[PDB]
Design an enzyme around this catalytic site. Structure first.
Site, PDB file in Angstrom:
ATOM      1  N   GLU A 209       0.831  -1.212   0.000  1.00 53.00           N
ATOM      2  CA  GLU A 209       0.000   0.000   0.000  1.00 53.00           C
ATOM      3  C   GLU A 209       0.871   1.269   0.000  1.00 53.00           C
ATOM      4  O   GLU A 209       2.061   1.210   0.319  1.00 53.00           O
ATOM      5  CB  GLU A 209      -1.047   0.014   1.141  1.00 53.00           C
ATOM      6  CG  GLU A 209      -0.459   0.151   2.532  1.00 53.00           C
ATOM      7  CD  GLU A 209      -1.409   0.249   3.719  1.00 53.00           C
ATOM      8  OE1 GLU A 209      -2.648   0.187   3.524  1.00 53.00           O
ATOM      9  OE2 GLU A 209      -0.899   0.411   4.853  1.00 53.00           O
TER      10      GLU A 209
ATOM     11  N   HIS B 281      -4.842   2.293   7.906  1.00 51.23           N
ATOM     12  CA  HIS B 281      -3.592   1.882   8.549  1.00 51.23           C
ATOM     13  C   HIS B 281      -2.767   3.101   8.915  1.00 51.23           C
ATOM     14  O   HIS B 281      -2.725   4.051   8.137  1.00 51.23           O
ATOM     15  CB  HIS B 281      -2.780   0.968   7.617  1.00 51.23           C
ATOM     16  CG  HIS B 281      -3.427  -0.344   7.307  1.00 51.23           C
ATOM     17  ND1 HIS B 281      -3.148  -1.016   6.137  1.00 51.23           N
ATOM     18  CD2 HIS B 281      -4.308  -1.074   8.028  1.00 51.23           C
ATOM     19  CE1 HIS B 281      -3.865  -2.125   6.175  1.00 51.23           C
ATOM     20  NE2 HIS B 281      -4.585  -2.202   7.289  1.00 51.23           N
TER      21      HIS B 281
ATOM     22  N   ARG C  98       6.824  -2.845 -11.825  1.00 51.32           N
ATOM     23  CA  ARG C  98       6.736  -3.279 -13.224  1.00 51.32           C
ATOM     24  C   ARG C  98       8.143  -3.280 -13.877  1.00 51.32           C
ATOM     25  O   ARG C  98       8.557  -4.296 -14.452  1.00 51.32           O
ATOM     26  CB  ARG C  98       5.797  -2.350 -14.013  1.00 51.32           C
ATOM     27  CG  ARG C  98       4.502  -3.009 -14.453  1.00 51.32           C
ATOM     28  CD  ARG C  98       3.561  -2.018 -15.111  1.00 51.32           C
ATOM     29  NE  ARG C  98       2.854  -1.192 -14.130  1.00 51.32           N
ATOM     30  CZ  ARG C  98       1.608  -1.414 -13.720  1.00 51.32           C
ATOM     31  NH1 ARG C  98       0.913  -2.435 -14.209  1.00 51.32           N
ATOM     32  NH2 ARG C  98       1.045  -0.611 -12.820  1.00 51.32           N
TER      33      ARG C  98
ATOM     34  N   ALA D 204      11.063  -3.413 -12.413  1.00 47.86           N
ATOM     35  CA  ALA D 204      11.980  -4.335 -11.728  1.00 47.86           C
ATOM     36  C   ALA D 204      11.837  -5.805 -12.191  1.00 47.86           C
ATOM     37  O   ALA D 204      12.685  -6.635 -11.842  1.00 47.86           O
ATOM     38  CB  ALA D 204      11.802  -4.234 -10.213  1.00 47.86           C
ATOM     39  N   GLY D 205      10.787  -6.107 -12.964  1.00 48.64           N
ATOM     40  CA  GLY D 205      10.527  -7.452 -13.465  1.00 48.64           C
ATOM     41  C   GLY D 205       9.477  -8.253 -12.707  1.00 48.64           C
ATOM     42  O   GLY D 205       9.350  -9.459 -12.937  1.00 48.64           O
TER      43      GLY D 205
ATOM     44  N   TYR E 147       5.448  -9.274 -11.673  1.00 48.79           N
ATOM     45  CA  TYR E 147       4.203  -9.451 -12.422  1.00 48.79           C
ATOM     46  C   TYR E 147       3.172  -8.552 -11.748  1.00 48.79           C
ATOM     47  O   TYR E 147       2.734  -8.833 -10.623  1.00 48.79           O
ATOM     48  CB  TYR E 147       3.790 -10.938 -12.456  1.00 48.79           C
ATOM     49  CG  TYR E 147       4.778 -11.795 -13.218  1.00 48.79           C
ATOM     50  CD1 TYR E 147       5.922 -12.291 -12.600  1.00 48.79           C
ATOM     51  CD2 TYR E 147       4.596 -12.069 -14.573  1.00 48.79           C
ATOM     52  CE1 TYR E 147       6.855 -13.041 -13.306  1.00 48.79           C
ATOM     53  CE2 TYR E 147       5.519 -12.827 -15.290  1.00 48.79           C
ATOM     54  CZ  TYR E 147       6.651 -13.307 -14.654  1.00 48.79           C
ATOM     55  OH  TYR E 147       7.569 -14.048 -15.355  1.00 48.79           O
ATOM     56  N   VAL E 148       2.886  -7.401 -12.386  1.00 48.91           N
ATOM     57  CA  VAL E 148       1.994  -6.381 -11.827  1.00 48.91           C
ATOM     58  C   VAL E 148       0.653  -6.307 -12.593  1.00 48.91           C
ATOM     59  O   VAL E 148       0.673  -6.057 -13.794  1.00 48.91           O
ATOM     60  CB  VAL E 148       2.702  -4.995 -11.717  1.00 48.91           C
ATOM     61  CG1 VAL E 148       1.818  -3.958 -11.027  1.00 48.91           C
ATOM     62  CG2 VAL E 148       4.049  -5.107 -11.006  1.00 48.91           C
ATOM     63  N   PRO E 149      -0.520  -6.501 -11.921  1.00 46.08           N
ATOM     64  CA  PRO E 149      -1.804  -6.392 -12.645  1.00 46.08           C
ATOM     65  C   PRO E 149      -2.172  -4.936 -12.980  1.00 46.08           C
ATOM     66  O   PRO E 149      -1.489  -4.013 -12.529  1.00 46.08           O
ATOM     67  CB  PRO E 149      -2.805  -7.031 -11.674  1.00 46.08           C
ATOM     68  CG  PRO E 149      -2.231  -6.780 -10.329  1.00 46.08           C
ATOM     69  CD  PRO E 149      -0.733  -6.826 -10.490  1.00 46.08           C
TER      70      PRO E 149
END
Ligand SMILES: CC(C)(COP(=O)(O)OP(=O)(O)OC[C@H]1O[C@@H](n2cnc3c(N)ncnc32)[C@H](O)[C@@H]1OP(=O)(O)O)[C@@H](O)C(=O)NCCC(=O)NCCS
Ligand SMILES: CC(C)(COP(=O)(O)OP(=O)(O)OC[C@H]1O[C@@H](n2cnc3c(N)ncnc32)[C@H](O)[C@@H]1OP(=O)(O)O)[C@@H](O)C(=O)NCCC(=O)NCCS
Ligand code: NA
Lengths: 381, 616, 258, 90, 78
Positions: B230, B272, B292, B294-295, B297-299
């Site tokens: 977050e 939080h 993204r 850095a390699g 897997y980002v949705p």
């Protein structure tokens, strides 16, 4: 959370508690705060306008002219209300000091380009010799600043600060101050924080409803948080958990309804029926004040709970909805629910039985529906 | 191994009396087919002892210690502490557990712990090669091996998310609630989690996300890493730097929440404590972009998280990195009784009926009347007895009569049976309650019971139509003294004041005194024999109480007979005489009175002979 | 009872009743040997009404009901119930009076008392409730506190208890001053308001358990009520359900003597 | 009492009586959860006989007699007497 | 004295009780129970004896009591 404090409050704390670790005779508590309902005179509304070297007659001239003045700061257009009045210190030198914390300890920053001094969490300041200081101009005035920034760290450490900035200081007198207190320290700081209250950010006016929720939140280990973003907003939310509430807000913004988003709220840590009832009553109150042409939407969401009892919490939600029955129908409110967790089936049963008698549409979902699926279901249809 | 946090042999202490959390841990151990419970002891700062819980359907005993050092010394095998102390006690208790040589992991549940205290716990943990999960977390779990307190909720949810057996996914989040949603997401889009940890939402956690990601990287069982961060703070930048430095070779799914922030005011503090982007670098956008690049897997958004997990899991299957598991037997635990009853799944018959009071609701009820209404209406003690004993809202003269009787019978000196026994028990050093009952237990047919007899005998005579002369005559023939008639000193010329006070009040205030009119006709006859054959106090109470009931009008002849038979009148005597009994007991305590022994000369010892005790 | 007329603490019974001293006045004479002021005697009578009954489920009422269901007479059944009155049922009254009086006497600031009790691992007697809280108060407490606030000359120990209560409710909302706490504390204030009791006399009243007596007297009303109720209903013998008991017999080895 | 036969500290009642454990043995099981040796069980029974009575003048007997004289049943009268047992009597 | 002391010796002779277990036995009042159980016999005996004799209601003799009422001044609140 870290909460910013007025320069008045920070300087008052300094002049009171700093002459306990040091021989701080150099600074006196000569401070005056001017509010909407109440020499150097400057606004104390958490900024980054300063009237230097003036008479009290000239100071009252600035005050009346700038009180209630409409100004745009940070894209936010608000009126000027709070100002600080203090003595003018004629100075030549200008030094900077700031204390902030990282995962390994506290960092002290000093300048006359900036030197950094790391204070380990377990070792403390006593474990450190200050040979890391700037020798360039700090000759006759080096042991005094070493002693002062050492005292400032002790003051930072014992008074529950999350951030302190003296930008600048001269001779040893503070000129401008910016400070943040870790609000979680409250219980340990009842005597030192006695004379202060956390101010609202510039532009924003205090909310009776928000302060009522903050009041419930203080008498429990559970979390009940409410922030009104837009009173005239169409989309209202009552999401369980810190993580999930942020995600529901992300989805609403992702669908282009950032403007209609009436509030950012959150309840979690297993609040009882009474706590959830008062919270739901507050949200319902605020959304039934104004009548919108395309109606209003209430999203009662959350993740699959780990320990928050869905039966007890939704019993409080159902009780408030029952009470707001007339105001709910009249405001064309549509309720959308998605919930999982301890006794969820009993909780969803209460909501389904309610929707069948209240006279308002109540769409009820469980763990089978994707967490944020009630957002497009309510905003696209 | 160093990378393993918990396994199937992990033993723990639960600090704080959290019975539901204790039950949740045991229930998970049961469905996982564990040999032993995951809990060695409970630490309860208020009390040492035992705690009973379920092991499936079988009840087991867990020991319960007052302190952490005492528990640690008894159970050195326990290396985990699940800390349910409040935010006001979390530091001191975690620090004490970390100082114990046998404890390695402390999970801090409390929300609202100061940032300095958390920093000091984190540093203490790192210095001693220990782990702090939290503060402000539910904890985490190793699927099929161990759960921290309430992590992953109900057993239904554990079954539905197939958490009773491990998968290949190593999961880490900030959010506790999202850790449970993630368990559901991951089980639906892969073979499920192997292990999952929530580090909490505080700005300065006990352990950072990377600490757990690094453990997953070393663990051979884990082939896939998934995390949910977050906005606010630079924790996720430790991961991105480790991802860039090739320290994380396993495929990593990553999503940072808080994309809403730039659309809303910069002042907004989220749920939080650590969820507030101070700088642009701290925002969800800057974090997801750096992830993204850095390699990882980002949705596109949180909606596509599961889809990303499905894509990475499928890639491991194609390359043969992950092997297909056969689904083990689906476990089963019976529903808790209280859940079945609350949902209306079952119906349970009650053992008792109560018609006089109800403490179940918003407010205590006496015979259906709210206590605040009883007191606002000044019903008094007599009115309260009217409700609780007769289930009536009595008229003012009746309620005052009850209160008059109580004052009149409050005490009759120390010499009577009841007071005498209470005084002896008090002189023996007994507490007030024991001493009171010792005295109350003399109340019956000879001490206090002439009240119930006078009501019974006079009511019958007057009902059956017997003329006072016939009643006096009948009783004499049977050899029965009239109950409520007679006094040792008082007579017609010298009356008992207690009687006079009661008769005068009834004569002046009762709507009807028919049984009193009859009793006075009887009294004229008895005093015509001997002047001391006056209507005594006991007779007066019994008779006037029948008249009070006849004056109320709401009692039938039968209802009145029931009142006499059930001994309501003995109760009134008991209540009123307890005042003087308690008074006598306290009086002997003030005086410092000694043990009583009855004088030997007041007893005639008449032992049987040797012949008399023989059996023929 | 020796003379021409019965005397309560030297006062003729006819004078007690002609003066309308009431039940509270009679207790004042017989227990404290005092002619109490009107607010004190009414407070005693208010406490009796407030504690008269708390439903059938509590220890005392529960035992009296079982004895009544076994066909026992009223008196036996009453004592069976009264004999549960002690440190856990009724005794938080005497503990709240003792603990609060000591803290406030020895000068302890409310914060120091709250802190000291937490360190010893002792819950504050007279503090806490299962359902009632700051937003939803117990009416029994409210009725007692409101009467004392309005009618007592002094409420020094109540003022202290309310400072303590602000601290406990700042932790958990249900950490309110309960009924038992309320009685114990207000009874010390009543005695301090009378003026005829020294510090020692007050300490003696707490030590001797006068307050347990007041609870016993008032709760006998509801106990007698429950016993009579089971008699009217024709209730049967009670047997505790077998499934509510975990039978944990020792082994043959465990019962051996070495 | 749940099973086929009543158990005292896990021992069947028929075994307690077939073994002539006696009253002392029954107290050993029910109070100390022990199968006591013969000298210990007989000592318990000796103490019971020795303390059975000490005449009518002592607190307990005296209170029981007063309640009996007040026409109370055996059980009420017994408890009236037993409730004197404490720091000075027994 | 004899019962309390010999009961500790009996427990030490059994061997199955630790020092703590023995302290618990003394603390919980097992010994008051033994006295109560035994003295019940003579208590029941005396109750039945008065029933056989047809004994009358007892009233403590008036001359065995010193009545010492407080004065009007002593009962005042000030
Ligand atoms: C942490 C938690 C388990 C603590 O339990 P709790 O119900 O708040 O309270 P406790 O049992 O600790 O009692 C609260 C206090 O009241 C005190 N107290 C209780 N009865 C008392 C009495 N009669 N008199 C005085 N004090 C009393 C206790 O001593 C305790 O004091 P402390 O806080 O100073 O130690 C609970 O608040 C919780 O579940 N919070 C949620 C945390 C969370 O959301 N985490 C993130 C999940 S992702
Ligand atoms: C003859 C004497 C012994 C009778 O004794 P007493 O004290 O008057 O009375 P008793 O014991 O007989 O009781 C009087 C009546 O009250 C009745 N009574 C007592 N208690 C009662 C009660 N509670 N309810 C109803 N009736 C009751 C008795 O049944 C008896 O009835 P009865 O006269 O119809 O038979 C007595 O009066 C006396 O000594 N008289 C002197 C005679 C005299 O001077 N002779 C010459 C000497 S030279
Ligand atoms: Na809170």
């Amino acid at each position: 959370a870290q909460r910013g404090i007025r320069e008045y409050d920070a300087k008052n704390l300094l002049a009171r508690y700093l002459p306990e670790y040091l021989d701080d005779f150099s600074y006196k508590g000569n401070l005056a705060l001017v509010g909407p309902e109440t020499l150097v005179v400057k606004p104390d509304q958490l900024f980054g306008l300063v009237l230097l070297d003036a008479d009290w007659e000239e100071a009252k001239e600035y005050l009346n002219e700038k009180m209630g003045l409409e100004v745009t700061i940070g894209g936010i257009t608000g009126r000027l209300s709070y100002f600080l009045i203090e003595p003018f210190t004629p100075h030549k030198e200008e030094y900077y000091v700031a204390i902030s914390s990282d995962y390994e300890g506290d960092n002290i920053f000093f300048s006359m380009k900036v030197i950094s001094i790391h204070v380990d969490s377990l070792e403390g300041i006593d474990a450190l010799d200050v040979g890391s200081k700037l020798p360039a101009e700090l000759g006759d005035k080096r042991a005094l600043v070493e002693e002062f920034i050492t005292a400032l760290w002790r003051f930072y450490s014992d008074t529950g600060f999350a951030y302190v900035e003296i930008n600048p200081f001269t001779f040893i007198v503070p000129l401008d101050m910016v400070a943040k207190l870790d609000d979680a320290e409250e219980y340990w700081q009842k005597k030192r924080w006695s004379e202060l209250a956390f101010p609202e950010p510039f532009g924003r006016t205090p909310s009776k409803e928000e302060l009522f929720i903050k009041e419930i939140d203080s008498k429990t280990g559970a979390s009940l948080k409410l922030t009104i973003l837009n009173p005239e907003g169409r989309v209202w939310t009552m999401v369980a958990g810190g993580g999930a509430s942020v995600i529901y807000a992300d989805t609403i913004c992702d669908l282009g309804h950032a403007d209609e988003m009436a509030n950012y709220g959150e309840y979690s840590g297993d609040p009882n029926t009474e706590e959830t009832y008062h919270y739901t009553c507050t949200i319902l109150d605020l959304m039934t004040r104004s009548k919108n042409p395309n109606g209003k939407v209430l999203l009662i969401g959350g993740a699959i709970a780990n320990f928050t009892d869905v039966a007890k919490t939704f019993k409080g939600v159902v009780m408030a909805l029952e009470e707001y029955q007339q105001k709910l129908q009249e405001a064309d409110i549509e309720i959308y629910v998605r919930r999982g967790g301890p006794n969820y089936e009993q909780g969803l049963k209460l909501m389904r039985d309610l929707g069948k008698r209240l006279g308002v549409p109540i769409q009820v979902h469980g763990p089978e529906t994707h967490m944020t699926r009630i957002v497009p279901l309510a905003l696209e249809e | 191994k160093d990378y393993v946090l918990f396994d199937i042999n992990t033993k723990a202490f639960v600090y704080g009396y959290q019975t539901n959390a204790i039950q949740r841990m045991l229930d998970f151990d049961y469905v996982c087919k564990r040999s032993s419970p995951s809990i060695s002891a409970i630490i309860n700062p208020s009390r040492a002892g035992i705690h009973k819980a379920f092991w499936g359907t079988k009840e087991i005993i867990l020991p319960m210690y007052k302190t952490i050092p005492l528990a640690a010394l008894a159970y050195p095998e326990a290396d985990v502490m699940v800390n349910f102390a409040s935010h006001r006690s979390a530091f001191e208790t975690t620090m004490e557990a970390l100082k114990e040589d046998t404890i390695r992991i402390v999970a801090v549940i409390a929300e609202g712990v100061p940032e300095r205290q958390s920093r000091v716990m984190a540093a203490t943990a790192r210095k001693l090669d220990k782990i702090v999960i939290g503060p402000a977390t539910v904890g985490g779990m190793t699927a099929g091996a161990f759960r921290i307190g309430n992590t992953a909720g109900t057993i239904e949810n554990i079954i539905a998310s197939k958490l009773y057996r491990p998968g290949c996914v190593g999961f880490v989040s900030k959010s506790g609630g999202m850790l449970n949603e993630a368990f559901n997401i991951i089980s639906r889009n892969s073979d499920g989690i192997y292990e999952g940890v929530a580090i909490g939402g505080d700005r300065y956690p006990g352990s950072n996300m990377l600490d757990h990601i690094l453990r997953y990287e070393r663990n051979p069982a884990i082939k896939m890493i998934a995390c949910l961060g977050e906005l606010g703070g630079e924790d996720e930048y430790m991961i991105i730097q480790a991802l860039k430095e090739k320290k994380i070779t396993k495929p990593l799914v990553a999503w940072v929440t808080g994309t809403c922030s730039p659309y809303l005011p910069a002042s907004v503090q989220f749920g939080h404590a650590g969820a507030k982007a101070n700088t642009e670098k701290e925002t969800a956008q800057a974090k997801n972009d750096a992830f993204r690049q850095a390699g990882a897997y980002v949705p596109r958004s949180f909606d596509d998280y599961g889809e990303m997990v499905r894509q990475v899991y499928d890639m491991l299957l194609t390359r043969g990195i992950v092997q297909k598991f056969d689904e083990p037997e689906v476990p089963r635990i019976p529903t808790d009784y209280s859940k079945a009853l609350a949902t209306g799944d079952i119906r349970k018959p009650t053992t008792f009926i109560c018609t006089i009071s109800d403490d179940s609701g918003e407010e205590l009820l006496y015979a259906g009347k709210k206590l605040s209404d009883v007191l606002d209406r000044k019903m008094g003690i007599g009115g309260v007895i009217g409700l609780l004993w007769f289930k009536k809202e009595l008229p003012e003269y009746a309620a005052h009569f009850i209160e008059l009787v109580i004052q009149i019978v409050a005490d009759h000196g120390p010499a009577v049976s009841g007071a005498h026994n209470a005084i002896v028990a008090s002189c023996a050093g007994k507490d007030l309650i024991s001493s009171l009952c010792s005295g109350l237990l003399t109340i019956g047919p000879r001490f206090g019971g002439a009240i119930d007899d006078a009501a019974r005998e006079f009511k019958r005579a007057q009902e059956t139509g017997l003329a006072p002369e016939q009643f006096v005559g009948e009783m004499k023939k049977k050899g029965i003294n009239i109950p409520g008639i007679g006094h040792k000193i008082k007579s017609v010329k010298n009356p008992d004041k207690r009687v006079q006070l009661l008769i005068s009040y009834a004569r002046a205030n009762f709507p009807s005194t028919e049984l009193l009119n009859y009793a006075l006709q009887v009294e004229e006859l008895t005093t015509a024999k001997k002047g001391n054959l006056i209507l005594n106090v006991d007779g007066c109470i019994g008779i006037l109480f029948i008249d009070l009931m006849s004056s109320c009008g709401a009692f039938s002849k039968e209802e009145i007979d029931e009142v006499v038979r059930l001994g309501y009148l003995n109760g009134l005597f008991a209540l009123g005489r307890s005042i003087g009994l308690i008074g006598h007991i306290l009086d002997q305590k003030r005086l410092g009175s000694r043990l009583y022994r009855h004088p030997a000369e007041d007893i005639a010892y008449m032992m049987p002979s040797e012949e008399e005790i023989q059996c023929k």
